[model samples]
Target chain A: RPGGDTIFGKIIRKEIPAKIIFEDDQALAFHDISPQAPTHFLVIPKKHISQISAAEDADESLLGHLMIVGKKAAADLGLKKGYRMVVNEGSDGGQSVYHVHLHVLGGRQMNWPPG
Target chain B: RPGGDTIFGKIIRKEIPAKIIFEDDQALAFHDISPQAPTHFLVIPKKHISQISAAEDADESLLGHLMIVGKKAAADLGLKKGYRMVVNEGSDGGQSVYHVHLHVLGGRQMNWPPG
Candidate 1:
């Protein structure tokens, strides 16, 4: 399952290739293989952590770093008009990957009541 | 309307009272009057900027600031196990408030296929 050793982990380790868009010392941003929007990307940390529920207080800095990196990735991805950022926590939240990631979606007028 | 001048605007100005959980120079985090989870808070900026669609490239710092504040709020809210962060942009996106805001939700095992 994705929760216990995932494709995302392989991507994090560069074991699998992803259409990378942005990267920094603390984070990495890449295009989702199955994109929901014209600009759909995933921002993740190098460290392996399963879901937001797995986060600790000490992970605060890492969380902040992810956001900073997400913003930069959005800007670089031409999401200047606007974009949607999502962090799904678990299976109920449609988290296909166990490792935490931020979904950066944009490039069209996104509708509400999201699926 | 919330887009031009709305209740959220007044709340941003402290004209109304919201169960604030976190606040700083760039942003404010408060409990959602109608919470979806055991812990549901809204992290918003003091400025009355409408949906993400209305944001400009210059707002990158503001966006990053919101995430940083959100992490702190999540930790303070005792979401040690985990949490979900969401930004509902347009009406179709389940965004009732026009002013840009991030939803900080936690306190239970969140279900997927979210409504």
Candidate 2:
């Protein structure tokens, strides 16, 4: 999946409709259909990188930009209490989509085991 | 804790002993004594940014660097199955430590409800 295009790529290209909340040159933010929390969304890089494990050194700025943008996007959604930023990689990490995405989840006290 | 120092600062300053695995000018990574997975550790920015919500725009490159470094560190640990990267902010997110840190967890298939 590292070199393949994913559903997220279509979302990035606007070929598919998502409730996009924020967009910049390097990143995009949209709602997650399956809400794990009240304020749940996904932020993704415009560039195609499969997973965090597939990310190269050159992707540093882009990855960082995703985290910052996720924060801003969460703030816009009124996640004032706080949020959890998560990047899941491969099957073990529960990464359903191959394209890299940062999940901004909050609005309730997130209990742990942090699966 | 945005402007105040926390235990992570002490660890970075080498005032404490942690299983330091990796270090760079802008970040430090150490094993999480209380491991959630077989392979668990934390990658934190050397700069004393308290939490993700408190991180400023100027910290973008540094934040990106931390993520990249975390990936590399996980690779070095031979986490070929992949991992989950998490950043918890404030109380509701289950952030026990005040200072910003990225948790790298793997070595078991992380289940969902991702705490």
Candidate 3:
């Protein structure tokens, strides 16, 4: 793609086709290609942000917008019963991607303490 | 501690004892007794709000605040490298408490599929 750009960046630009479920000016939600649950998806910011630890206080408003968008996107999907929203950071947090995406996982009982 | 409420509500009111790590007029952050990682903690609203599935769009402000607070809380804990912030909704999402809360987990490599 580029010398330095995330796949999510490609997904946002439609460079990579994805099963996008919801999208707005500030956020985007879509199905995870390799879903781990009956219903697994991801929510991400339209603008690029590396990680929470790296984000400054100025990014708070955008972070919050993404949070609500995540919930609304999950509800739009048939995840009315229950769902889990997770934001993984770095390798230790199992963040396979560097674009800082929010994971919406549900459709079955999630494990305690989480993997 | 009232007739109908979540333990988190009790924590907000100081009716129950907890090792609080951070607090503000809008939210709070604290250590998770049952640590899932070397640095495991919770970020919650001062006011009680149910699962994400049930929150109204009007509540988006509070939700966003919590999200940023979660990151800031993790940063304060020296989790500058990386960390995960999770919010579990309802039973399938493994939400033991009814009140909405964000889980900040880090300090080691997190598991794939997040259990």
Candidate 4:
């Protein structure tokens, strides 16, 4: 809403190029540049937040909507077998982008304990 | 609330044994029987549902509580270094348990693509 936009915000506005897969007023989904699975997509909120850690009580409904968006997107993409929804936190969590993003992945078998 | 209870239902009713880390009316988290990372736990809701795929508009609030439970559980676990949240689905997603469970992991680094 203000300044100091992150890389995702730029993608949201179509500034930087990205292979977008889904979109709605509140959230957006796209393929990861560095694909980790056969089906790897990022479902991100239109609004900008550093991370889910930045989310608060007031943001409950917002994140809830985002969560549902991830759920539905998985179905829409026909991840008929199954899928994994992941959100990284900080560098330790391997979160490169500063904004909150849900990694909706599927279309293959995932290793246990995650990477 | 009937018979044919799932494994998670047993845990909620104390019919089974689990190293519970956190609990509330809506959800519960426990240490994984098999350690994946340094700190890995399963956060599950008390409700019975096959998967997020079954979740509809009504389940929104319930899952929202579960999601928030995961958020708070992370903070409580001293994951100051950051963490990863994972919810596997079906056989392809490698979900051993049939109930809706959120895997809260931290105390170490997670590989990308989650598999």
Candidate 5:
């Protein structure tokens, strides 16, 4: 179980005004506080699951729900042309927030050799 | 629709045997040809959906199924402790393959700022 004090937790509780783009019973989608692309957004679960480690084999429903929400959010962002989804974890992997969130980025001709 | 001649397509056909670690009806998991981490696996859909843009709202079942498979694969790879899942799209984001795949990376202490 994740402690309820992540930056995303504050976003979820409406304590910080996130520029929300989409939301449903299971997830929330918003513009990234820091944008990395022409189209950058974060799709997150409402529940307090920190990372993939916090999920179990039985969490299929939540996993599916998040993806569906992600797709909808992408379409809403006009990524019908193209997009990318990413979930970074831990410090070395570039995960700044402890909260588990999916990054949806697009709206430009992305490059190769990402680093 | 993706052309059936990608490097990953060869791997799927067994023409080039990827160091596979996990597979299911909906997805496949294997070592990255070029590993960025101690444990780096590529979880890919069998179908030739070039990118997230190929997926539709109706693909929710496949999306959910993939995440469930990803969790199982991560645990199998001893990532119950921790891991990162990423999908880079287009050129600038570091996606090399035209075929869509998920990167499951772990087995080391990751870094911050990701770049």
Candidate 6:
């Protein structure tokens, strides 16, 4: 059930709309519906991995590609100054969505104790 | 100033001491001196890239490898249940260090607003 249906799946499948920032055969970057920062978005693999803990050796390329795309997205958004990338796993990690995602947040000064 | 010298460089060069968790040709994982969570550590590329924005396309494999190494380190630390990975860029991202590093934190519930 790791890669099962989730809201992100809907976004990936285009069943729902998203302000897509970047896309490729293996990944998708879009704005977070609810933003915690002035510039907040998520980059996720089109193929689900649930949470990072569920990612396997086979997902190495996809995982790295997500980071690359995140950087590109930030640059495109004029966040050339700075940003933050975050991935949450399981309940203790405060993961509400079952699908794995890379959160890209910026456009403001981030604080310590990243929680 | 990006790659000149820093605390992490000292750790990598063995000039300073750190609780190293994992190491290899391209990366290093170590315990955070001042942890925000019960389980908190950092993974960084051996070859410095001051910040994520400073990373070039050539650093793709290394960037991705860091994630893999971080996951491996977490698994070794018994964080199979859940964790959070964070990368801060520049001042706006609350990046204290010039060298790029990925943070892996868990062992307790993470909160929202990740700030």
Tell me the DockQ of each model, to 2 decimals: 0.22, 0.80, 0.67, 0.67, 0.38, 0.71
- Scored on chain A only, each candidate's TM-score is 0.89, 0.94, 0.91, 0.90, 0.88, 0.95
What candidate 6 gets wrong by more than 4 Å, as runs, is A1-4, B1-4
Tell me the tens digit of each residue's lDDT in model 3 across A35-95: 9999998888887887666666667667777778777877787777788888888777787
Model 2, residue B110: C-alpha shift (Å): 0.5
Q: Would you give me the overall lDDT of model 1?
A: 0.71
- Candidate 5: segments with Cα more than 4 A from true spot: A1-5, A78-81, A107-115, B1-6, B79-81, B91-96, B109-115
Candidate 4, residues A1-115, lDDT tens digits: the string is 5312888877888878788777888778888887777888888878787887887666666666766887787788788988888878876688887898888788888777686
Clashing pairs in 3: A64-B64, A92-B110, A115-B114, A115-B115
The prediction achieving the highest TM-score against the true structure is: 2
TM-score per candidate, in order? Answer: 0.66, 0.95, 0.91, 0.91, 0.76, 0.92
lDDT at A51, model 6? 78
Residue lDDT tens for model 5, B1-115: 2225788788777777878888766677888777877787888877777765555555655665666566677778776446667666555445667887877777776543233
Q: Tell me which of candidates 2 and 6 scores higher on DockQ.
A: 2
- Superposing all C-alpha atoms, what RMSD in Å does each candidate have to the true structure? 5.5, 2.4, 2.6, 2.1, 3.8, 2.3
What are the per-residue Cα lDDT tens digits for candidate 2 across A1-115?
2224888877877778999999988888999989898888999888888888778877787888888898899888888889898999888899988899899899999988788
TM per candidate, chain B: 0.90, 0.94, 0.92, 0.89, 0.86, 0.94
Q: What does DockQ come to for candidate 1?
A: 0.22
Docking class of 2: medium
What candidate 4 gets wrong by more than 4 Å, as runs, is: A2-4, B2-4
